[PDB]
Amino acid sequence: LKNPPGPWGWPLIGHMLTLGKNPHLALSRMSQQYGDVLQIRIGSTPVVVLSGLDTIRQALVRQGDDFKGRPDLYTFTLISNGQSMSFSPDSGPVWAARRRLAQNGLKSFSIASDPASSTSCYLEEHVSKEAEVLISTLQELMAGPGHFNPYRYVVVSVTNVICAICFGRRYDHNHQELLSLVNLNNNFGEVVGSGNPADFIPILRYLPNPSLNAFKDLNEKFYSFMQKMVKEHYKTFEKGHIRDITDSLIEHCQEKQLDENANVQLSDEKIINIVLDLFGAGFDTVTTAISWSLMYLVMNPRVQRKIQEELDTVIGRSRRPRLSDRSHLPYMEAFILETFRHSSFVPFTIPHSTTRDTSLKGFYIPKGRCVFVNQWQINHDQKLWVNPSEFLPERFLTPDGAIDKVLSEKVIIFGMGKRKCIGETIARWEVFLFLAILLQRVEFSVPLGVKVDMTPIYGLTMKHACCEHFQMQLRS
Ligand X SMILES: C#Cc1cccc(Nc2ncnc3cc(OCCOC)c(OCCOC)cc23)c1
Ligand Y SMILES: C[C@H](CCC(=O)NCCC[N+](C)(C)CCCS(=O)(=O)[O-])[C@H]1CC[C@H]2[C@@H]3[C@H](O)C[C@@H]4C[C@H](O)CC[C@]4(C)[C@H]3C[C@H](O)[C@]12C
Out of 349, 353, 354, 408, the only residue in the binding site for ligand HEM (CB under 6 A) is 349
Q: Where in 396-470 does DSSP place strands (E)?
A: 442-445
3-state secondary structure of 2: strand
Q: Where in 188-327 does DSSP place strands (E)?
A: none
User: Least separation, in Å, of the C-beta of 412 and ligand HEM?
Assistant: 9
User: Least separation, in Å, of the C-beta of 348 and ligand HEM?
Assistant: 8
Residue 261 and residue 56: Cα distance in Å, rounded? 40
Residue 251 and residue 237: Cα distance in Å, rounded? 9
Out of 6, 9, 71, 282, the only residue in the binding site for ligand HEM (CB under 6 A) is 282
User: Least separation, in Å, of the C-beta of 269 and ligand Y?
Assistant: 4
> Does residue 141 bind ligand HEM (CB under 6 A)?
no
Instruction: Give 272-311 as a DSSP string.
Output: HTHHHHHHHHHHHHHHHHHHHHHHHHHH-HHHHHHHHHHH
**Taking CB within 5 to 8 Å according to partner kind, which of ligand HEM, ligand X, ligand Y, none is near residue 280?**
ligand X
**Taking CB within 5 to 8 Å according to partner kind, which of ligand Y, ligand HEM, ligand X, none is near residue 414?**
ligand HEM
The answer to the question of whether 421 is labelled as a binding residue is yes
Out of 419, 441, 463, 464, the only residue in the binding site for ligand HEM (CB under 6 A) is 419
Q: How many CB atoms lie within 10 A of CB 6?
A: 21
Alpha carbon distances (Å) from 131 to 147, 274, 307, 352, 442 = 19, 27, 18, 36, 12
**Taking CB within 5 to 8 Å according to partner kind, which of ligand X, ligand HEM, ligand Y, none is near residue 231?**
ligand Y
**Taking CB within 5 to 8 Å according to partner kind, which of ligand HEM, ligand X, ligand Y, none is near residue 81?**
ligand Y
Residue 284 and residue 79: Cα distance in Å, rounded? 15
Which of these segments, 69-77, 79-87, 231-239, 382-390, binds ligand X (CB under 6 A)? 79-87
Name the packing angle between helices 424-441 and 330-343 (round to 10°): 120
> Does residue 9 bind ligand X (CB under 6 A)?
no
Name the packing angle between helices 424-441 and 122-143 (round to 10°): 40
> Does residue 213 bind ligand Y (CB under 6 A)?
no
User: Least separation, in Å, of the C-beta of 287 and ligand HEM?
Assistant: 9
User: Least separation, in Å, of the C-beta of 22 and ligand Y?
Assistant: 37
Out of 295, 350, 360, 435, the only residue in the binding site for ligand HEM (CB under 6 A) is 350
39-98 positions binding ligand Y, by CB under 6 A: 81
Out of 72, 125, 232, 268, the only residue in the binding site for ligand Y (CB under 6 A) is 268
Largest CA distance in the chain: 71
Which residues, other chains included, contact 329 with Cβ-Cβ below 8 Å and sequence gap of 6+? 310, 311, 314, 321, 436
Out of 78, 272, 276, 334, the only residue in the binding site for ligand Y (CB under 6 A) is 272
User: Least separation, in Å, of the C-beta of 79 and ligand Y?
Assistant: 13
> Does residue 276 bind ligand Y (CB under 6 A)?
no
User: Least separation, in Å, of the C-beta of 164 and ligand Y?
Assistant: 21
> Does residue 265 bind ligand Y (CB under 6 A)?
no
Residue 310 and residue 316: Cα distance in Å, rounded? 9
3-state secondary structure of 224: helix
From the list 178, 186, 246, 161, the residue with the least C-alpha distance to 427 is 161
The answer to the question of whether 370 is labelled as a binding residue is no
Query: Are 186 and 453 contacting, i.e. CB atoms less than 8 angstroms apart?
Result: no
> Does residue 227 bind ligand Y (CB under 6 A)?
yes
DSSP state of 359: E
Closer to ligand HEM by CB, 321 or 415: give it. 415
Instruction: Report which secondary-structure segment, H or E, holds 47.
Output: strand 45-50
Residue 60 and residue 66: Cα distance in Å, rounded? 8
> Does residue 397 bind ligand X (CB under 6 A)?
no
From the list 197, 335, 350, the residue with the least C-alpha distance to 284 is 350
Instruction: Give 261-277 as a DSSP string.
Output: T--SSS-HHHHHTHHHH
Rg from Cα positions in the chain: 23
**Taking CB within 5 to 8 Å according to partner kind, which of ligand X, ligand Y, ligand HEM, none is near residue 79?**
ligand X
Alpha helices by DSSP H, listed for 144-244, are 150-166, 176-182, 188-192, 197-200, 210-235
- Residue number of the CB closest to ligand HEM reads 423
Closer to ligand Y by CB, 230 or 360: give it. 230
Query: Are 374 and 26 contacting, i.e. CB atoms less than 8 angstroms apart?
Result: no
> Does residue 86 bind ligand X (CB under 6 A)?
yes
Which residues, other chains included, contact 261 with Cβ-Cβ below 8 Å and sequence gap of 6+? none
**Taking CB within 5 to 8 Å according to partner kind, which of ligand Y, ligand HEM, ligand X, none is near residue 269?**
ligand Y
User: Least separation, in Å, of the C-beta of 360 and ligand X?
Assistant: 23
Binding site feature residues for substrate: 188
Residues that bind ligand X (CB under 6 A): 79-80, 84, 86, 186-189, 215, 218-219, 222, 276-277, 280-281, 284-285, 346, 460
Binding site feature residues for heme: 421
Residues that bind ligand HEM (CB under 6 A): 86, 99, 102, 162, 277-278, 281-282, 285-286, 289, 346, 349-350, 413-415, 419-423, 426-427
Binding site feature residues: 188, 421
Residues that bind ligand Y (CB under 6 A): 81, 227, 230-231, 234, 253, 268-269, 272
